[PDB]
Amino acid sequence: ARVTVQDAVEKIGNRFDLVLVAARRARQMQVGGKDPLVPEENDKTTVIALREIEEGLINNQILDVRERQEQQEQEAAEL
Amino acid sequence: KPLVGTGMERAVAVDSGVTAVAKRGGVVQYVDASRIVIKVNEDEMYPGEAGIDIYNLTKYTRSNQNTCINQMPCVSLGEPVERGDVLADGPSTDLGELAL
Amino acid sequence: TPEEKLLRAIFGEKASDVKDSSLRVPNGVSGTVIDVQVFTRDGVEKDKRA
Amino acid sequence: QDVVLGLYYMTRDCVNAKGEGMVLTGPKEAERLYRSGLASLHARVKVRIT
Amino acid sequence: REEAVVWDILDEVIREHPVLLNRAPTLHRLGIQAFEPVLIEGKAIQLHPLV
Amino acid sequence: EIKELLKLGDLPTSGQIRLYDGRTGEQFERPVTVGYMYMLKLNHLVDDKM
Amino acid sequence: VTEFLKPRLVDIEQVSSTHAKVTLEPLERGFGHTLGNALRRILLSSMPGCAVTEVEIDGVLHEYSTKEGVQEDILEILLNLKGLAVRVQGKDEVILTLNKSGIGPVTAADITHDGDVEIVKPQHVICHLTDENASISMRIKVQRGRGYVPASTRIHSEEDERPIGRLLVDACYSPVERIAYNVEAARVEQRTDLDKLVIEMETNGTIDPEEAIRRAATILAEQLEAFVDLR
Amino acid sequence: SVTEFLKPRLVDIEQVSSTHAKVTLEPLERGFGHTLGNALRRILLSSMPGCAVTEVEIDGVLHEYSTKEGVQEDILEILLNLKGLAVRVQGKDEVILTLNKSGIGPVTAADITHDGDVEIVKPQHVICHLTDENASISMRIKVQRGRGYVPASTRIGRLLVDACYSPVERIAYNVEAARVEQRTDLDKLVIEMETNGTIDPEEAIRRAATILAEQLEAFVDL
């Protein structure tokens, strides 16, 4: 779990952009078929989001390129 | 009662009408959680009069602030009372003193 | 609505013409009923409790 | 108020307090002495501090 | 009915879910702060001393 | 007069006794003012607040 | 140096029916306060005793009412019955009966005698009848238990909808009222560092001092098993 | 019934290191956290037996405020370093170790002469340092068996060391709230204990509880 978010704010250079990126990733994990990149230790999707931010596994650029990738793969099914 | 008080407890408890104060002195003919019957002394009764004072006690009624106001008889059966003696307590009253 | 109309059609429990507006104990309050008073308007017949 | 008073009372010194003058291997031995009642919380003492 | 299972559910739903506690007059922005709730059995909130 | 009444009841005239912790059984380091205060339950009850 | 002198229950001085001084001796230095406070914390919270849990008075529907002829309210009669010291041999529940008529104090000595139930203080005034035709008749459900159990934590324990007139009484089952202990020096056979623990003990009279020391030591020694194993 | 108490179901021993652990017992009855925690704490702290360096006799030193050249610290700090020397003695209650060393660098606890019935649990324990390559440190150390903490002030050539007999170095306990089936009033006992290395923490808690149960076994009913 998280008691202070200071490690995530050092990777994402703001608190407001941190809130936005973590809300986007937590909405991916909560309503959506996406799976966490860290072991879910009985945490809610907000804390799993912040723990993925803290480890450097997720930021706005990674989220954007992953969206581009899954959208291009879903559009690749031209049949 | 307060172990430390100022002496105004009795005045506050008696001058408020929460308690039952003997109008005429006498002897407690009958004491009961719902009423006190006082046999008035011969010195204090008028001619042509039964000479008995009945005090009906307020039991478990609602105050304005939804608390319980309830009068408990203080005297015992047969004991003598005087004019002005507290006969039944009120809410927040201990033997005629003000116990908040 | 049509869905509960079908629900009435399947199970058959016809809804009642009356609505429960009874007096209930407020939540959190727990105690003893110590008095009941019934005030009936003159002309209204008194129930067994009154 | 309570916290400041606790930390002030703990961190004061008394002159001839119980257990004055001994030399301790560190903070853990000081806690041992205090809890064992072998030294008072104000005894001026010599502690090996890292 | 407050069954015994809704209390386990309630322990689940508040786990990492902050709540905002506010004491009016909110004179400055520290008059609203978030906290993770710990379910207690009283009827009074237990506010940490340092805040 | 309060100290004279405390002496009459065989009490410490300073109004302070030594207490012991209930959980650990060890004596509080200073005498504590113990006595009888007349407490009042005020009508601001947490049942009516929550 | 690795062996300890173990205490024995040396002396039990019965100061009163509800007072005692139990001497535990010898105690190696340091074990006086360890044992004394462990035993005090266990005695003061965990001793079993019987307490009145329900009352059923004859013509009474609820506590906030009065009976005619009785000087007390029904609520004051319930508070007078909550302090009924009673010890029950063999059962865990027994329904005593109190029937009484005429003027006078209804004390605990008017409770109808059972064979396996002993009223410790028979002078305990329960109520006062202030009329000669007045009569009280009630059934008092004494029950065995531990600690403090309020009636609002017993409104759920209901096999069936409890009748109107069974007045619940908040049960304080603990027999001990006050525990003190002193740790004095003892003199044992060429040794001077041995303590002696005098547990001064005040109860409602419904538990034996030796039996309560036995129960406290047993509760402690069976709670220490999770540490002696430590798996 | 009225004699059945809750006993700890969850026991999470967390070894933070070889000589420092955190035991967590849950759930206790309400108030038994403090009963058990303080009883075991008093026993571990004051009554648990062991062996400790009690006295030292150094050749050229007469009292703790004397001087010694060749060693880089006061005799006070040598006594402070011998106070922390943990040692197991198998057979006896009194052993005299000997430390004779000249050279350059630290004199660890591996420099003590090897007795047959003495185990130094940390041979790299720095006692003092030697600085000049012509001075020696030569002392007769006196390991004695006892229990608890016996400071040298009570025990008043030789230089008395505070005898830390008990194997524990720190013993703390917290009592937190614990719930079982909507009974939140239960206790949870978190013991944090560090020993000096002679025994692990779990053995120290086991030995303390054994000492307490053996004090009680004259009143207990089985």
From Swiss-Prot, chain A:
EC number of the protein: 2.7.7.6
DNA damage listed as a keyword: no
Domain of life (superkingdom): Bacteria
Primary enzyme class: transferase
SUPFAM superfamilies: RPB6/omega subunit-like
Keyword Transcription: yes
Alphabetical keyword list: DNA-directed RNA polymerase, Nucleotidyltransferase, Transcription, Transferase
Self-association and partners: The RNAP catalytic core consists of 2 alpha, 1 beta, 1 beta' and 1 omega subunit. When a sigma factor is associated with the core the holoenzyme is formed, which can initiate transcription.
Similarity section: Belongs to the RNA polymerase subunit omega family.
Known function: Promotes RNA polymerase assembly. Latches the N- and C-terminal regions of the beta' subunit thereby facilitating its interaction with the beta and alpha subunits.
Name of protein: DNA-directed RNA polymerase subunit omega
UniProtKB/Swiss-Prot annotation, chain C:
Lineage: superkingdom: Bacteria
Signal peptide stretch: none
Disulfide bonds: none
Protein's job: DNA-dependent RNA polymerase catalyzes the transcription of DNA into RNA using the four ribonucleoside triphosphates as substrates.
Assembly and interaction partners: The RNAP catalytic core consists of 2 alpha, 1 beta, 1 beta' and 1 omega subunit. When a sigma factor is associated with the core the holoenzyme is formed, which can initiate transcription.
Family membership: Belongs to the RNA polymerase beta chain family.
Protein name according to UniProt: DNA-directed RNA polymerase subunit beta
Full protein segment contained here: 896 to 945 of 1342
Swiss-Prot record, chain E:
Lineage: superkingdom: Bacteria
Protein family according to the UniProt entry: Belongs to the RNA polymerase beta' chain family.
Binding partners and assembly: The RNAP catalytic core consists of 2 alpha, 1 beta, 1 beta' and 1 omega subunit. When a sigma factor is associated with the core the holoenzyme is formed, which can initiate transcription.
UniProt function note: DNA-dependent RNA polymerase catalyzes the transcription of DNA into RNA using the four ribonucleoside triphosphates as substrates.
Name of this chain's protein: DNA-directed RNA polymerase subunit beta'
Organism: Escherichia coli O157:H7
Lineage start: Bacteria, Pseudomonadati, Pseudomonadota, Gammaproteobacteria, Enterobacterales
Residues of the full protein shown: 403 to 453 of 1407
Curated annotation (Swiss-Prot), chain G:
Reactions it catalyzes: RNA(n) + a ribonucleoside 5'-triphosphate = RNA(n+1) + diphosphate
Enzyme class: transferase
GO MF term set: DNA binding; DNA-directed RNA polymerase activity; protein dimerization activity
Regions annotated as coiled coil: none
Highest taxon listed in the record's lineage: Bacteria
Disulfide pattern: none
Biological processes annotated in GO: DNA-templated transcription
Quaternary structure note: Homodimer. The RNAP catalytic core consists of 2 alpha, 1 beta, 1 beta' and 1 omega subunit. When a sigma factor is associated with the core the holoenzyme is formed, which can initiate transcription.
Biological function: DNA-dependent RNA polymerase catalyzes the transcription of DNA into RNA using the four ribonucleoside triphosphates as substrates.
Family recorded in the similarity comment: Belongs to the RNA polymerase alpha chain family.
Protein's name according to its UniProt entry: DNA-directed RNA polymerase subunit alpha
Organism from which the protein derives: Escherichia coli O157:H7
Whole-protein coverage range: 5 to 235 of 329
